[PDB]
Amino acid sequence: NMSLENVAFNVVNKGHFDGQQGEVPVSIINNTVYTKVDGVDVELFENKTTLPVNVAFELWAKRNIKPVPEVKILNNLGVDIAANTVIWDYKRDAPAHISTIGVCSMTDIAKKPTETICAPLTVFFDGRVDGQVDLFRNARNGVLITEGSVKGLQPSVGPKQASLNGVTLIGEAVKTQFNYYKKVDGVVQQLPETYFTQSRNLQEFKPRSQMEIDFLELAMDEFIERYKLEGYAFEHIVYGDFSHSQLGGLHLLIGLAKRFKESPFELEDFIPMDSTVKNYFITDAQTGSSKCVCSVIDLLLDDFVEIIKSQDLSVVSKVVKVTIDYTEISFMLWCKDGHVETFYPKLQ
Amino acid sequence: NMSLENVAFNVVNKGHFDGQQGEVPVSIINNTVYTKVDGVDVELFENKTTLPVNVAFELWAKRNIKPVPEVKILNNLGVDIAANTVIWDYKRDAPAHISTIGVCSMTDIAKKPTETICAPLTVFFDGRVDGQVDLFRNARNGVLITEGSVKGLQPSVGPKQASLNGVTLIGEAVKTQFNYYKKVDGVVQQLPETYFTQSRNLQEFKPRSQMEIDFLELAMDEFIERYKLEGYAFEHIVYGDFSHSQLGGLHLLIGLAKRFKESPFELEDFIPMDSTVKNYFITDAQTGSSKCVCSVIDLLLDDFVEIIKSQDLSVVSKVVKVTIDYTEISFMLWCKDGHVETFYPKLQ
Amino acid sequence: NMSLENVAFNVVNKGHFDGQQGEVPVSIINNTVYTKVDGVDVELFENKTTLPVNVAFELWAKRNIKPVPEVKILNNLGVDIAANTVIWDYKRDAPAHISTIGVCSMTDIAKKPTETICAPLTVFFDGRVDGQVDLFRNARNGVLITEGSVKGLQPSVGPKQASLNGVTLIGEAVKTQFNYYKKVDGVVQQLPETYFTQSRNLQEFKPRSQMEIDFLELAMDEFIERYKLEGYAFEHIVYGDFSHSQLGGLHLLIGLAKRFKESPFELEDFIPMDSTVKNYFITDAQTGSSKCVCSVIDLLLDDFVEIIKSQDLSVVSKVVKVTIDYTEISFMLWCKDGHVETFYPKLQ
Amino acid sequence: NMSLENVAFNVVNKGHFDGQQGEVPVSIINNTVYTKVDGVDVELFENKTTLPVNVAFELWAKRNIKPVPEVKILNNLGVDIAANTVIWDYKRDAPAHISTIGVCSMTDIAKKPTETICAPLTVFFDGRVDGQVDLFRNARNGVLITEGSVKGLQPSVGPKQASLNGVTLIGEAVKTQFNYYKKVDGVVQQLPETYFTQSRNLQEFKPRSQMEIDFLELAMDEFIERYKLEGYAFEHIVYGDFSHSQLGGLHLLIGLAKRFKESPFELEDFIPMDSTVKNYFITDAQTGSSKCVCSVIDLLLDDFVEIIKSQDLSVVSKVVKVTIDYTEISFMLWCKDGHVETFYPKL
Amino acid sequence: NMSLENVAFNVVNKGHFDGQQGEVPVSIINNTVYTKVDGVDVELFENKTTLPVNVAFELWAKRNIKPVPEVKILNNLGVDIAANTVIWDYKRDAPAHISTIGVCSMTDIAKKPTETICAPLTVFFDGRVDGQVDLFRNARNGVLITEGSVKGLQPSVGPKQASLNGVTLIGEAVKTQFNYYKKVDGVVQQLPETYFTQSRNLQEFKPRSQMEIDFLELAMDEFIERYKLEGYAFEHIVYGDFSHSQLGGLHLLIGLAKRFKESPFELEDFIPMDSTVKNYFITDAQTGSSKCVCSVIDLLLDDFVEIIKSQDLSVVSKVVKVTIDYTEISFMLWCKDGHVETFYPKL
Ligand SMILES: O=c1ccn([C@@H]2O[C@H](CO)[C@@H](OP(=O)(O)O)[C@H]2O)c(=O)[nH]1
Ligand SMILES: O=c1ccn([C@@H]2O[C@H](CO)[C@@H](OP(=O)(O)O)[C@H]2O)c(=O)[nH]1
Ligand SMILES: O=c1ccn([C@@H]2O[C@H](CO)[C@@H](OP(=O)(O)O)[C@H]2O)c(=O)[nH]1
Ligand SMILES: O=c1ccn([C@@H]2O[C@H](CO)[C@@H](OP(=O)(O)O)[C@H]2O)c(=O)[nH]1
Ligand SMILES: O=c1ccn([C@@H]2O[C@H](CO)[C@@H](OP(=O)(O)O)[C@H]2O)c(=O)[nH]1
Ligand code: NA
Ligand code: NA
């Protein structure tokens, strides 16, 4: 069940825990696990978690190495724990969940998700593993992903992308789009209509629609005229205003990506975790414009246009609710004289 | 006055300390501050200072987030402490000064700079803050920056650039060029004529004059002929000599920047701090030429040309003094038969 | 013999230990050595070794700063210890050897390699240092490098590249190709014929033959036809197969380098050390193809072609032995119907 | 205004957390909490727990400073968590329980014991606190102590002693004997009839009956004759046999106390925690007799005599179950020819 | 040739820093200093301070090993720093002062006390060291101790006891009673008339007057009658009241010493530092009586009797100021009907 030296043997020989027999010599110093290779010590793992170093080492070695839902999705769906696996949170360099089921003797609260202690918890089930669909059917609270149809259950089509060893990708050699199912108190839920964030990053941003291609290629005024965006404050919200000491707008990742290719800037990720909305302390290196809390979301530009064009613009300020990544994201909408002033998501 | 959980609340909600009421749960493990977000721990701060972790966390959260003088300037002007702010040293990942005034109960030596304990110390005053010009007028020892004129005081025009959240920049949406004033023992000082370093970096180096543009674009022999630099050893001092085991010359940042675009090399910053002169252990990857102590300064090329063309070349070796960043920098000048052999700054 | 403050003085003033007299104030906190510079603490060294922080600091300061053999070569030749120097292992951020000879009072097992305790150990001798060739002649077990001929000893021509301050390079201003000699139990050995790995890296990979230039420039099918590689599974072994969930082949660095310029991927170096064969956990970001243990070797493409074209292809699977970096590397060769299926090195 | 600096203010000014307003400067280094007193740092708390230093500091400051059941009693009753207090485990220098209810934002799983997350946990309730008897009635799983009767509930009289700030004592100025009640799955459970251990220690051991006074003062042969203990191997079980390399017997604390006054020995407490039965690696300094696992229990000698005399001595070896401190303690009984060879508890 | 390895050489060979030449190999791990002795590591120093381990090691090695004033005296006199020595605080296992003068490159603010940076600090000067009386005369702020008269300066006779390597003692082979002098803002300051605490401890408490001998040997009623202490609540203040849940009185160390010989109790020193008044969280093991903040002072019983008998007993409650160890100690006096209820010092 447990053996630090056997975990290290699997890491050295298989790249992760693979259930192989064997042992290697291990040193633990502070928060770092070493193994002896021909007379000298080689670092295997640096603990960045709040768990004991040897426990975090084992959970990391036993991480799920298939494509799995991004942590923000599991969090938004209320997942508390995973059935017989570890979802490793690469944004936090730590397990996504505090406890485990049938993984590690120090963190297990149960060997199987059918045990009583798991009933009030929302357990994550993976239909790609034999028997887990049936475990979901019998579980009181849970979230299930599948690659195909489940008899008698209507699916919710999830995002196109998933996380594979910390790399978020849309799979071509592997399936990353899952069907989602959720049960609460033994009742199968109808998951709401939702947008999905695109989980792209600033430096290798790639467009996923013709509008996004046009946004990156065309000048600001050409793009706004082509897609008839006059009065929606896209100059402020998406392109960003760098003329004053406080940086204006800049709430869509594609706008940051366009600026970054032209002029670099600093993004301080002061709450480093996976979430649908991200807050950054941004400092523009060219102008000196800055903002302590700049909320950023990566929506497909077409989706963001649909959202802002579907709002009433008759009051000065109000909260707009948008279902994104299965959760209700609050946006602040500021208007003046029937046109938009700004529109930004809130991290909550 | 003091509350670790309130500091963390401000960091999470405002990106820095903003004087807001509230608390979040905090964990301190070794030298890392965490906060609990929906059942899991998220890292807020890793202490790299020699201060206690919770104290360094508070000083970092209370850092000045306006454009401020670079630490090398404050050090050269003899600044010991700041009035009611924290100058964060991003080169050292630590406070620029050991003690504080009216910032933190663990590090404060006073609540106000008018207290007796501050009289012998050179206190930094910021004229952009209400009342600090008057505090400078009454202070015994101090350095004051302003954006405009001060009645009855002659200013010293400082560098064009300043530091904003660790980004050194010439402000366009914000003012980064300050007037400087200094008092010693109650007497307003005449600050000397000085050159200023340009605070650029190796990889995104940008020219700031036509001579620098020509240096980057033209070949070595074309540039030297155009600006009539024969006999000043620019081939050695600025371009660098990579033909022997010991790397020759290479003491101006623009010369390193030109080499780096053509051929990468290793720069070991073995004294990592902000200073007018920097010493690097350099290893050229293409040739294997190396040098344990390679002194580098980032002067505007036009300024460096003026300096070296203003020296007497009649002795084999001597020390040349140049006022740079308000301090007296010693250069070694080596000559032979009336022409320069080398010319380099000394870190002292 | 020993002085922590004197080691730090040499680091600050000379960039490494240089035998100079002097002292600076030092702070040791956890695993970090600091020195006080004008009232504030500056980090000099962060200990990443399993040694005490002050001991590792001294060994790092006393590292060899000339071109030295890469650690993988010394390990393959059985080197246990170095004569009167420290070979710093930049892959491990630690000394390459556990003990020293005449370097450090905490780690020395002897002052001179002629002492009895060194006789059973394979001592590394550097012919560029006065007297070390003669010490090798009198030593029982040892490895010697020279830049030129040694009277009465036949040399083995080593690799073209060597390590200079952690930068692996083929020297142009300095000599990096050494003659190698080895003695075991007082008997000079005949070192075997061997290939050498090229020690290049993924991102600045440079071809070293016309075949490698053609591999990077031509399309897959053009290159295979030009060099008549039909039936040798180069599409699988070198170019890689990204069509299935398990990534196929990709065992030569030049193939990874070609893929990386076109499409980025993740390489997890889960045994971070210097070795002739490297194992990576690879995840392709474009396709999602991945493999937990992907063995990679950087052979000159011409050498790899010679190796695979010199094998018998008549059995389904067998182990092939290839002398590389002076050690016997085991390759697995898989064949079907007289053609290659795959061919990969094993890390052992 | 809950804060690290406010916790430290209460410790400095009140000796523990007392809900007072105020702050003092705090430094956290080396898993230790310091406060600044006239320019220099004074240590307030060294963390010996597996919790973060600032969290353990707060739980320690918020420890219950009234007499509370010993941790071994709470463990034997299956207590998982306490309602709105912290039971500090002075044998482990750590909280007795991992989580809290309405104590600390970092460790709370709930603010009140009525929340659903507490239902499957056995919550400790203190009838001396207003409202906690009613919370016990509504809790699905729990343990309740009171100083008096609770209408309708059948009580179990607990041990005479309790723990006050880490001092186990029989209260004279305070009450330390409580009624006990327990609920499992929403149903009140009958607590078993039980002996209680005496919770004494080697150095300041004091007899609590005439038989224990006789054992300490009389010689071995005289005591066994007076209390008619022939055939029960008291020479082995209680007095101990130091004649062989392996130390024989010595399973009652009073026997260790008698030996210790005569000749010192080493007791390695290799599982340092509060428990009804303790295991020690014992080395006798005079003879060199030793034993890696010597199980020791502190029963009133009268109780142990009552237990062993009630045994059937016709079997070579059998396991005997005795309820002690509300838990079932297994004893190994070795006999030969109708007399006892040895009789020892198991951990 | 000042160095970490040279400090360790002096510790190993001389027991402290003695200015000798030499070096030994040193390892620094776990906030601890080791040296290699015949192949294995031997611990020389465990850092308990908030300074870096190698810095604290040097300051400890350079500690003053002559009799020096107790830290509570230096604190009460406002001492900020010492001239060319280290006063080691054995109650905190740390330097008594943050910075140094001419001791250690990492902590020095100056090489000599005459430097301008020292002028606003109260520097401790030791007249037993050549030149330090003259440095006191030139210092703007300072405290001076001497073994004899200084011409022109009016002395204050200090306590009989001093601290030698952490042992507080009244010297017989060495002098421990010093003259004291103090300067503020360049002006010599008259030190007040003062009592001194006796600096005794619970275990090895020894009486130092016939009244203290009587207190330990006589019964409570007999002692109060002989010394005519009726109406002064000595039963409460000194002997302590253990009859209620809250422990009453017990504010003089001699009263704790008398109780401790009779029955043990726990004293939690939750602010562990040297101070004229100490606060303890006390738990009586026999009765269970306890008190979170019990202020205790070790005055000669004759001095305490002199203090309390000089009091006006006509007010329900008032604060009484008494100069002790050169500082103003506030006492709370509670009276009723012309007799004392309680009388305790405040920290
Ligand atoms: O009258 C107001 C007040 C605030 N804001 C907007 O509210 C946000 C927080 O102050 C800012 O939006 P931004 O971050 O996109 O620039 C600001 O412009 C308005 O638009 N109008
Ligand atoms: O006769 C001498 C001795 C030294 N140097 C120069 O002094 C510096 C330190 O040795 C080197 O300058 P560099 O770093 O720019 O190459 C060296 O060339 C001379 O020019 N001439
Ligand atoms: O019948 C078999 C079994 C295994 N392999 C090969 O053996 C290796 C480990 O399974 C893989 O080679 P690769 O890493 O280059 O893809 C696999 O294709 C074969 O070629 N044929
Ligand atoms: O046949 C047996 C086997 C074991 N034991 C007893 O079982 C215990 C563990 O081996 C020992 O009892 P002690 O610790 O009190 O000396 C041993 O004497 C017997 O008495 N008889
Ligand atoms: O009316 C009052 C209020 C307080 N106290 C006393 O003040 C102290 C703190 O409450 C206690 O004194 P003790 O610690 O010596 O017992 C208490 O009895 C009185 O005597 N009378
Ligand atoms: Na339970
Ligand atoms: Na003072």
Side-chain angles (χ1 to χ4, degrees), chain D residues 11-16 29-30 34 37 39-44 60 63 65 164-165 167 169-174, chain E residues 31 48-50 92 96 98 242-245 266 268 270-273 281 283-289 292-293:
Chain D
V11 173
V12 166
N13 290 272
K14 295 296 185 176
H16 70 128
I29 323 171
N30 311 132
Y34 302 83
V37 178
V40 297
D41 295 325
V42 181
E43 169 179 323
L44 294 185
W60 168 73
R63 69 195 178 279
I65 63 160
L164 181 58
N165 308 317
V167 183
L169 58 92
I170 299 178
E172 304 177 5
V174 294
Chain E
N31 217 11
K48 304 306 294 290
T49 82
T50 59
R92 290 170 49 249
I98 301 94
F242 299 80
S243 63
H244 311 281
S245 63
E266 211 76 42
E268 193 188 320
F270 55 90
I271 310 179
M273 58 180 289
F281 193 148
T283 302
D284 185 67
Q286 181 61 49
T287 65
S289 197
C292 299
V293 183

Side-chain angles (χ1 to χ4, degrees), chain B residues 236-237 241 246-251 291 293-295 316-317 332-335 340-344:
Chain B
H236 179 90
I237 298 169
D241 183 357
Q246 162 113 337
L247 197 157
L250 205 66
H251 301 293
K291 179 156 63 192
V293 184
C294 188
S295 60
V316 170
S317 66
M332 282 302 307
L333 175 63
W334 287 87
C335 295
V340 181
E341 296 207 299
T342 190
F343 184 62
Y344 59 87

